[PDB]
Structure formats: C-alpha cells, structure tokens
Amino acid sequence: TNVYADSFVIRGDEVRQIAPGQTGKIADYNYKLPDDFTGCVIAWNSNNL
Amino acid sequence: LSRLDPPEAEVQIDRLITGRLQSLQTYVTQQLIRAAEIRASANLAATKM
Amino acid sequence: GKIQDSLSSTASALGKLQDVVNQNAQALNTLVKQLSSNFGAISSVLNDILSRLDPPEAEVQIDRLITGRLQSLQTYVTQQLIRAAEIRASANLAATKM
Amino acid sequence: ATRFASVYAWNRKRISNCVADYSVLYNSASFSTFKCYGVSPTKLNDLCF
Ligand SMILES: CCCCC/C=C/C/C=C/CCCCCCCC(=O)O
C-alpha cells in the first residue's frame, strides 16, 4: 500500500549512496532514504540512452 | 549513540536493555526469596513474643 | 449470631482468600499480555515475520521471540513456585491449628 | 598524489592537528567504493579521531 516510485538519474559511482545510512553528495544534498526505509531500490546502466 | 546511526545503534542498545533486565530480574528474585526467609523469622519472633 | 451477621455485612475479612485467587488470575493474564512484546524482533506476531521474511531471515526474528517467550514463562514459574512455598507454610500452620 | 605506492610496499601517512572536512572532496573526487567499519558514516562529522 501507499506505493510510490521515486525516479532519477545519477552517476554510476553514486549508486551506492542511495541506500539508507549513507553519506556523500547525493545522500546528503539530493536524495535521502530514511533509516527505517521499508521498500526496494532498483537501478540500471543506461549508457546508451 | 555517538558512534552509530539509529538502526545500528538499536541493535547494540537492545542487547544492553535485555541484559539490564536480566540483572534486575535476578535482583528481584533474590530479594523475594530472602523476603520469604525473613518472614519465617518474623513469624517465629512473633510467636516467641 | 454476631459472627454470622458480621460475615454477611463485611466481606473484607476474607480478603486473604480473595487475594490468593486474584494473584493467580493476574499472573495468567500477565502472560497473555506479555505476548505483545517484540523482544528485539521486528514484530511480536509470528505471522508478520513469516509472511514478509524468507526462512533464514525469519529465523533470526523468530529466535528473538522464542527466547523472549521463554523468559516470560520462566518468570511465571518462578513466581508461582515462590508463592507455593508461602501457601504451603500457611497450610502447615492451618493443619497445626486444626 | 602524483604517485602511489605499490601494494608491495604501501605507504603510511600520519595525520594530525587538522579539520576533517571531507565535503571538500565533493567538488571533484569520485569513489566507487566506500565503507566504514568502526563508525556509521553519518557520524563522521560529530566526532574527533
Ligand atoms: C585524510 C582526511 C582526514 C582523516 C580522518 C578521517 C576522516 C573521515 C572522512 C573520510 C572521507 C569520507 C569521504 C566519503 C566519499 C564522498 C564522495 C562523494 O560524495 O562524492
């Protein structure tokens, strides 16, 4: 329930910052997940799009 | 709490909370058994009085 | 005759017997209430754990609840056992007075 | 650094008397790997080392 899909483009070395508890320019200034996040994170390499 | 974020700190704290209750339960049980013994002494003392 | 009327009017004298009954009832109700505790688990309900987690993850959460549930039962047994020692002492005195 | 030591004979630099303001790296460094073991990374800014 209450299902939402957040969506964005980041640099490949920044994929690791999406997970909760991380720091870095994305985790701190652009997009942050809560400590108790209950969803799923999925990502892929769109280097031809 | 200073070194860990909430979700990690929670594990460490829960270990300490369980342990602290274990110490308190041990204490209460020992006081309760001793109370039974002091009561027996008090009953005898009342009888002798 | 005075005793008869006294007992009919005021029941407080019998509080000692009422207390034995109430204490055992409370101990059992306490065990039911303590089932709601998480004990470090995600949820106190086994069904929530089993529905959302696969076996190897569920096992961690379940083991936390199992240990916690035994802790509640051991506490109960110890309290009943100590109370049993006290009721026995009363019974021995009662037998002596008889 | 212009040059790094080989793993064969790795270097060990001592750091002292400074402010660990790692936000200075955000303008141009990129790290594919980053992991903290003794501290949650979100606590790095509230601590002395
Ligand atoms: C050499 C510095 C002083 C040593 C003392 C300890 C400092 C703790 C800081 C470590 C550096 C963290 C950088 C994290 C990566 C950010 C990259 C980005 O977001 O793009």
UniProtKB/Swiss-Prot annotation, chain B:
Subunit of the fusion protein that is processed upon entry into the host cell. Mediates fusion of the virion and cellular membranes by functioning as a class I viral fusion protein. Contains a viral fusion peptide that is unmasked after S2 cleavage. This cleavage can occur at the cell membrane by host TMPRSS2 or during endocytosis by host CSTL. In either case, this triggers an extensive and irreversible conformational change that leads to fusion of the viral envelope with the cellular cytoplasmic membrane, releasing viral genomic RNA into the host cell cytoplasm. This is Spike protein S2'. The chain holds residues 981 to 1029 of 1273 of the full protein.
Swiss-Prot record, chain D:
Changing S32F: In strain: Omicron/BA.1, Omicron/BA.2, Omicron/BA.2.12.1, Omicron/BA.2.75, Omicron/BA.4, Omicron/BA.5, Omicron/BQ.1.1, Omicron/XBB.1.5, Omicron/EG.5.1. Attaches the virion to the cell membrane by interacting with host receptor, initiating the infection. The major receptor is host ACE2. When S2/S2' has been cleaved, binding to the receptor triggers direct fusion at the cell membrane. When S2/S2' has not been cleaved, binding to the receptor results in internalization of the virus by endocytosis using host TFRC and GRM2 and leading to fusion of the virion membrane with the host endosomal membrane. Alternatively, may use NRP1/NRP2 and integrin as entry receptors. Binds to host ACE2. RBD also interacts with the N-linked glycan on 'Asn-90' of ACE2. Cleavage of S generates a polybasic C-terminal sequence on S1 that binds to host Neuropilin-1 (NRP1) and Neuropilin-2 (NRP2) receptors. Interacts with host integrin alpha-5/beta-1 (ITGA5:ITGB1) and with ACE2 in complex with integrin alpha-5/beta-1 (ITGA5:ITGB1). May interact via cytoplasmic c-terminus with M protein. May interact (via N-terminus) with host bilirubin and biliverdin, thereby preventing antibody binding to the SARS-CoV-2 spike NTD via an allosteric mechanism. It comes from the Viruses. The chain holds residues 344 to 392 of 1273 of the full protein. This is Spike protein S1. It comes from Severe acute respiratory syndrome coronavirus 2 (2019-nCoV). Changing S28F: In strain: Omicron/BA.2, Omicron/BA.2.12.1, Omicron/BA.2.75, Omicron/BA.4, Omicron/BA.5, Omicron/BQ.1.1, Omicron/XBB.1.5, Omicron/EG.5.1.
